[PDB]
């Protein structure tokens, strides 16, 4: 299978989604008019994974843009590559979601979803062999969270045999507009547990800490955070856009990364971490496994790795990569579960990203991600115990038991991680 | 002359097949377009090489070969490679969506979409045969197609070709050159469902081939290309007796007679010598005694195991090149005195010997030096059960936690098939233990 | 009964309506079914001027609802810094404990309201106060890896 269909929902979803298309367009030699002016034939070998080919050698992202807020669609269109997207693939309402999961999932979002699905169906119908879907969104707002998960459920129903992966931005008080974000995220996580195959946990807590403490940015902006996000998304999709010699679609990668269906929430990482000299292979490996490089605010040494994938990019010794990857598993063997033999796998892509000769992307399936869910759960519970702002959600038809159910599902997920963190062979 | 059809399933089977048929063409003097100037009977014949090649009226020699994969990437390379005109175009068969390293997809959900076409195309080849003797089936253990589709195909071939022999060349997984964490599952699943349907199976341990490339060929990081050319050299040494005049292993039935004392213990160990780097073009030539002694060194085995702690049930030596029979006999006599090679008490203790006097062939792009004499030893030793023990152990670690099982159960397989397959493997390990005595 | 109307006006931020109801005898210390007062609701929803007005006209700054929540608990939970300051100035109990064993310090810490944490500490918040699971605010900050908060909680 080849084609991927990309969906971006809500303000965060469209912002990081636009950056993703800017970055991989540059990597593939596609300018803002869809024209290919690249220099290497490898830039076009797998271009169809993310781009439809139009007339006149014009490449159009296979991307659908969704928002209940009109303004966000205007800002994407004015962006560097705004004119590159298919105009009919903009699906937006006029009312907005007001940071309310219930509005995105049941009210304004429910009224718009069928229009989005019509565009999705049109893109899917023109795929030779659709791999599946990737969605960008935040969990803390209303549209990306509430309408995003509605979209996921509808797509799961219509395309049950296709992979569904998300890049899901987790809320943090360090980058926060409101205290209802734990509500919105907790309601969303239950949806992701059941209906996605892989979810990349992009934690605004971690992004902020990286910019502030590592990059020394005194006042991190969304642009600073998104610089880390786009680097990560480029690295995570490298194996599908520059496959080199590996022969793996989305499903094959999910099979080898997800031993238990609900435990599909990944800790992403990237080296080197940069703000807007080349590292050595040992430095890449060390930084990739360092807690400070993780895009989810969890300490890997507080859990165990079920599986790990790492993508190195650039010109480097394949043997040296093997030696360093071996050394990490040897010195810290206790942090990799022994009952999944050979659970750390790596690939090397010769083509480095923009501005870096050496880089590495880390994808960890670690039980330590429970720390992220416990953090959100503690905030959810603090709010829910005092029943704060519940009428904003019950006013859209929701039941208080739906909050109770979401709390229980969240803590069940945490319990499931703990079960495999303590297991032994 | 009785024909043999080679079937190549999944990436590993296809890529190894491409290397094998390249070497076959070189050994028989066949060009990449199928022409064979040395074959003076144009458009027909019953020579030994016709077991593996048919002929067209235009003098084209066409492999009796089928290539099958569930996605097209690998077979597309055959369709456009140096030998793009060699094969029947309709015997290169591809789906669009692969088995995703999932046995269940290869055997049940996805494999079922193409199995009838594959069988109809094999039937076309079989109908071309005056006396088809059976099939040689090349595949990985670890891939979803190599494991699951191969099992499905072997099941179907047993029904449609009840009296035909089926031999396997099976790629046993090594994590050094694999990215499939679930390969132990696929390996056990396919072994369980294929055991009844396979008459003789030559396992090729990727770690063994990797070691030989690193240690003998001085290749720091072997590629599939490096591995496959070495594997093809060994496969050729095993199939030469079917393609040339000779006295040992002259048809598929004789492989079973010589190597498989009873049906489930049908996994011979191959050992090949000498393997010399092409950089050493002026190496001093090794004696018959030296290459024969090398066959009992673990470093030259196709599967990592220790025959010194097992029992032999069969031992065949297949020589190629400048090999005088009296020198083989003296080397064998020396082997028995110097080494401790223990046979079971119910089998003849003699070593069967074949000699093909043509110098061994190497592919010019290869990593191997030309040699004046080479030998492939095929033995059925209980020591190869150590390879099963290693796989079964990894299977057990993951299955105790039901890791990854949901992927298989969602693709048309009952969970009970896991334990059924594992119990069969436990019985197989017990079969070896009881023969070892 | 102007009590329910004052509760709703306080929740909705209807400043002029709050003044009218109080002028006509509305119970400034009315309670809803759960024991929340107008001051609780104004503190929860961020209506600073209403918080001031109610305190100027007899509101109990330390009233508790059925779950032990004070107005300060709720302002510290939601993150209304100016309201936290006003409540403390009018005698709010900085170490009030609710039915979950939480103090205002616990709630500001959980929700990452770092400026409010500093204010509470300055007004004598108990760094040793344990919730029903034994956790102090500092424990919460170490357990959840909030280094910025842990640094503040040490003085
Ligand atoms: N020696 C050798 N091993 C290979 C080759 N390709 C894959 N292997 C190994 O076979 C296993 C992976 O199975 P593949 O053959 O690639 O998978 P497949 O049969 O195409 O099945 P799916 O891709 O899962 O549909 C691993 O153990 C690989 O190391 C090859 O060309 N030569
Ligand atoms: N990393 C990042 N987070 C964002 C961005 N925009 C909004 N957010 C975050 O997403 C959440 C708000 O959701 P938002 O996408 O704005 O609401 P929506 O339009 O209803 O989906 C908060 O956690 C915000 O911190 C962005 O551009 N980058
Ligand atoms: C061998 C290697 C390193 C390629 C590997 N083995 C298992 N997983 C991966 C990598 C990935 N695994 C994934 O699941 C993955 C998901 C993805 C890809 C593109 C777009 C969205 C998600 N992207 C990856 O790079
Ligand atoms: Mg394959």
Measured in angstroms, the CA of C33 and the nearest CA of chain A are apart by 13
CA nearest A311: which of A238, A207, A413?
A238
What ligand has the least distance to the C-alpha of B73?
Answer: 4
- Distance between CA atoms of residues B10 and C4, nearest Å: 74
Catalogue all structural domains in chain C, each as residue range(s) with its CATH number. 1-155 (1.25.40.20)
The one-character DSSP state at B96 is S
For B170, half-sphere exposure in the C-beta direction (CA atoms, 13 angstrom radius) is 29
- Distance between CA atoms of residues C83 and C120, nearest Å: 12
- Distance between CA atoms of residues A10 and A147, nearest Å: 8
A156 reaches B (C-beta below 8 A): no
- Give the residues after which the backbone of chain A is interrupted, taking a C-to-next-N distance over 2.5 angstroms as a break: 276
CB-nearest to A343 from B181, B406, B407 is: B181
CB neighbour list of residue A219: distance below 8 Å, 6 or more residues apart: none
Backbone angles phi, psi at A338, to 5 degrees: -80, -15
- Distance between CA atoms of residues C149 and C140, nearest Å: 9
Domain count within chain A: 3
Residues of chain A contacting residue C100, judged by C-beta atoms under 8 Å apart: 385
Maximum Cα–Cα distance across chain A: 60
Q: How far is the CA of A85 from the centre of ligand 2 (A)?
A: 21
- Pocket probe for ligand 2: among A8, A11, A135, A230, the residue whose CB has the most ligand atoms within 8 Å is A11
B409 reaches A (C-beta below 8 A): no
- Let me know whether A328 and A275 are in one domain: yes
Nearest CA in chain A to C43: A388
- Let me know whether A386 and A355 are in one domain: no
Measured in angstroms, the CA of A365 and the nearest CA of chain B are apart by 13
What ligand has the least distance to the C-alpha of A70?
Answer: 2
- Would you please indicate which residues of B are annotated as catalytic (active-site) residues? 254
Measured in angstroms, the CA of C107 and the nearest CA of chain A are apart by 7
CB neighbour list of residue B243: distance below 8 Å, 6 or more residues apart: B24, B27, B28, B48, B49, B51, B52
For residue A391, give Cα distances in angstroms to A394, A398, B12, B151, B214: 5, 9, 60, 59, 69
Q: Do the beta carbons of residue A11 and residue A175 sit within 8 Å?
A: no
Resolution (A): 1.5
Q: Do the beta carbons of residue B32 and residue B86 sit within 8 Å?
A: yes
- Topology classification of domain B1-268: Rossmann fold (3.40.50)
CA nearest C57: which of C21, C8, C93, C32?
C21
Q: How was this structure determined?
A: X-ray
- Let me know whether A252 and A294 are in one domain: no
For residue B156, give Cα distances in angstroms to A93, A178, A321, B108, B419: 56, 63, 44, 13, 23
Residues of B within the annotated binding site for Mg(2+)? 71
- Distance between CA atoms of residues A68 and A284, nearest Å: 41
CATH number, domain containing residue A360: 3.30.1330.20
Please report where in the chains the tokens 């400034």 appear, as a residue: C28
CA nearest B167: which of B55, B74, B249?
B249
- Let me know whether A295 and A417 are in one domain: no
- Distance between CA atoms of residues A187 and A403, nearest Å: 7
Q: Do the beta carbons of residue C133 and residue A382 sit within 8 Å?
A: no
Q: Tell me: domain B269-383, CATH 3.40.50.880, correct? A: no
CB atoms A247 and B74 under 8 Å: yes
- Let me know whether A390 and A287 are in one domain: no
C-alpha torsion angle, residues B105, B109, B113, B119 (rounded to 10): 70
* Ligand 1-lining residues (CB < 6 angstroms): B 10-12, 15-16, 69-70, 98-101, 140, 142-146, 171, 173, 177-178, 180, 183, 206, 224, 227-228, 231
Question: Could you give the angle at the alpha carbon of B431 between the alpha carbons of B428 and B434, nearest 5°?
Answer: 155
Domain encompassing residue A48 = 1-259
Q: Which two tokens stand for residue A323?
A: 């030696």
Does ligand 3 have an atom closer than 6 angstroms to the CB of A198?
yes
CA nearest B87: which of B29, B1, B169, B8?
B8
C to B contact (≥3 Cβ pairs closer than 8 Å): no
CB atoms C140 and A378 under 8 Å: yes
DSSP B163-195: T-EEEEEEEE--GGG---TTHHHHHHHHHHHHG
CB atoms A297 and C113 under 8 Å: no
Backbone angles phi, psi at A306, to 5 degrees: -75, -50
Q: What element of type H or E holds C108?
A: helix C104-110
Q: Which atom of ligand 1 is nearest to the CA of B102?
A: 24
- Distance between CA atoms of residues B314 and B351, nearest Å: 8
Choose the final residue of a domain: A353, A368, A383: A368
Q: 3-class DSSP state for residue B22?
A: helix
Q: Provide the 10 A C-beta neighbour count for residue A334.
A: 9
Q: Which two tokens stand for residue B233?
A: 């050299």
DSSP B318-386: EEEES--HHHHHHHHHHHHHHS--PBPTTS--PPEEEEE-SPPP--TTSSBPP-SEEEEEEEEEGGGHH
Paired strand residues for A312: A348, A360
| β-strand pairing of A163-170 with A198-203 | parallel
CATH class of B384-437: mainly alpha
- Let me know whether A107 and A198 are in one domain: yes
Please report where in the chains the tokens 């880089």 appear, as a residue: A359
Q: How far is the CA of B73 from the centre of ligand 1 (A)?
A: 13
Q: Which two tokens stand for residue C91?
A: 């005698």
- Let me know whether A348 and A250 are in one domain: no
């Amino acid at each position: 299978m080849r084609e991927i269909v990309h969906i971006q929902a809500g303000q965060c979803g469209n912002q990081i989604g636009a950056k993703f298309w800017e970055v991989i367009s540059d990597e593939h030699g596609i300018d803002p008019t869809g024209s290919y002016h690249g220099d290497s034939d490898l830039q076009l070998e797998r271009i169809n994974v993310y781009y439809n080919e139009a007339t006149g050698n014009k490449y159009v992202p296979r991307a659908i843009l969704v928002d209940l807020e009109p303004g966000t669609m205007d800002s994407v269109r004015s962006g560097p590559f705004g004119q590159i997207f298919r105009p009919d693939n903009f699906v937006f309402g006029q009312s907005g979601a007001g940071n309310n999961w219930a509005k995105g999932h049941y009210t304004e979002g429910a009224e718009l979803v069928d229009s989005v699905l019509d565009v999705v169906r049109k893109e899917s119908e023109s795929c030779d062999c659709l791999q599946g879907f990737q969605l960008t969104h935040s969990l803390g707002g209303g549209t990306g969270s509430g309408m995003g998960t509605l979209l996921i459920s509808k797509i799961r129903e219509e395309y049950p045999d296709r992979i569904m992966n998300t890049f899901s931005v987790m809320p943090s008080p360090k980058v926060s507009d409101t205290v209802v974000e734990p509500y919105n995220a907790t309601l969303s996580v239950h949806q992701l547990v059941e209906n996605t195959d892989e979810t990349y946990c992009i934690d605004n807590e971690a992004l902020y800490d990286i910019c502030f403490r590592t990059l020394k940015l005194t006042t991190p902006t969304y642009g600073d955070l998104n610089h880390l996000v786009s680097a990560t998304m480029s690295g995570v999709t490298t194996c599908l856009r520059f496959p080199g010699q590996l022969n793996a679609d989305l499903r094959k990668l999910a099979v080898n990364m997800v031993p238990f269906p609900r435990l599909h929430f990944f800790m992403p990482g990237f080296a080197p971490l940069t703000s807007r000299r080349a590292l050595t292979v040992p430095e890449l490996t060390q930084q990739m496994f360092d807690s400070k490089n993780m895009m989810a605010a969890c300490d890997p040494r507080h859990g165990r790795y079920l599986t790990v994938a790492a993508i190195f990019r650039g010109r480097m010794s394949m043997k040296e990569v093997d030696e360093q990857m071996l050394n990490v598993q040897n010195k810290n063997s206790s942090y990799f579960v022994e009952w999944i033999p050979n659970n750390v796998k790596t690939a090397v892509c010769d083509i480095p990203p923009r501005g870096l000769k050496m880089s590495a992307t880390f994808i960890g399936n670690s039980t330590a991600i429970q720390e992220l869910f416990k953090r959100i759960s503690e905030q959810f519970t603090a709010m829910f115990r005092r029943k704060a702002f519940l009428h904003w959600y019950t006013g859209e038809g929701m039941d208080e038991m739906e909050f109770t159910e979401a709390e229980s599902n969240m803590n069940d997920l945490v319990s499931e991680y703990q079960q495999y963190q303590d297991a032994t062979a | 002359m009785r024909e043999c059809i080679s079937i190549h399933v999944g990436q590993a089977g296809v890529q190894i097949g491409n290397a094998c048929w390249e070497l076959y063409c070189l050994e028989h003097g066949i060009q990449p377009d199928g022409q064979m100037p040395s074959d003076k009977t144009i458009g027909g014949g019953d020579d030994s090489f016709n077991t593996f090649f048919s002929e067209t009226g235009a003098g084209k020699h066409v492999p009796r070969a089928v290539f099958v994969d569930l996605e097209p990437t690998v077979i597309d390379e055959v369709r456009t490679g140096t030998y793009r005109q060699l094969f029947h175009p309709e015997q290169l068969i591809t789906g669009k969506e692969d088995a995703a390293n999932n046995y269940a997809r290869g055997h049940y959900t996805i494999g079922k979409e193409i199995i009838d076409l594959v069988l109809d195309r094999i039937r076309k080849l079989a109908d071309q045969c005056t006396g088809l003797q059976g099939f040689l089936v090349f595949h990985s253990f670890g891939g979803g197609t190599g494991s699951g589709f191969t099992s499905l195909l072997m099941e179907r071939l047993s029904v449609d070709y009840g009296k035909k022999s089926k031999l396997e060349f099976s790629i046993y997984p090594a994590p050094q050159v694999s990215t499939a964490v679930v390969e132990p599952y696929n390996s056990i699943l396919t072994t369980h469902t294929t055991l009844e349907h396979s008459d003789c199976a030559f396992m090729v341990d990727n770690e063994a081939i990797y070691d030989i490339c690193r240690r003998n060929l001085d290749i720091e990081r072997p590629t599939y290309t490096n591995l496959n050319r070495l594997i093809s050299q060994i496969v050729s040494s095993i199939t030469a007796s079917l393609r040339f005049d000779g006295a040992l292993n002259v048809d598929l039935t004789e492989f079973q007679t010589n190597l498989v004392p009873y049906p489930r213990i049908h996994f011979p160990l191959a050992t090949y010598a000498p393997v010399i780097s092409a950089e050493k073009a002026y190496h001093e030539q090794l004696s018959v005694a030296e290459i024969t002694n090398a066959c009992f060194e673990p470093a030259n085995q196709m599967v990592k195991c220790d025959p010194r702690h097992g029992k032999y049930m069969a031992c065949c030596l297949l020589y190629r090149g400048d090999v005088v029979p009296k020198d083989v006999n003296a080397a064998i006599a020396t082997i028995k005195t110097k080494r401790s090679i223990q046979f079971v008490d119910w089998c003849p203790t003699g070593f069967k010997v074949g000699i093909n006097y043509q110098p061994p062939t190497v592919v010019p792009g290869g990593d191997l030096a030309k040699v004046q004499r080479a030998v492939c030893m095929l033995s059925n030793t209980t020591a190869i059960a150590e390879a099963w023990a290693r796989l079964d152990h990894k299977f057990d670690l993951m299955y105790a936690k039901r890791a990854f099982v949901h992927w298989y159960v969602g693709e048309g397989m009952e969970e009970g098939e896991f334990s059924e397959a594992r119990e069969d493997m436990a019985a197989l390990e017990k079969d070896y233990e009881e023969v070892g005595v | 009964d102007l009590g329910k109307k004052l509760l709703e006006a306080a929740r909705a931020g209807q400043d002029d309506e709050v003044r009218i109801l109080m002028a006509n005898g509305a119970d400034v210390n009315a309670t809803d079914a759960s024991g929340l007062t107008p001051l609780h609701l104004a503190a929860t929803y961020g209506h600073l001027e209403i918080v001031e007005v109610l305190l100027k006209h007899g509101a109990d700054v330390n009233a508790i609802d059925i779950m032990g929540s004070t107005p300060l608990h709720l302002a510290a939970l939601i993150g209304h810094l100016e309201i936290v300051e006003v409540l403390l100035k009018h005698g709010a109990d900085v170490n009030a404990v609710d039915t979950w064993g939480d103090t205002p310090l616990h709630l500001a810490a959980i929700m990452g309201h770092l400026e409010i944490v500093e204010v509470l500490l300055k007004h004598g918040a108990d760094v040793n106060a344990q919730d029903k699971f034994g956790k102090t605010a500092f424990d919460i900050s170490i357990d959840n890896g909030n280094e910025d908060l842990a640094e503040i909680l040490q003085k």
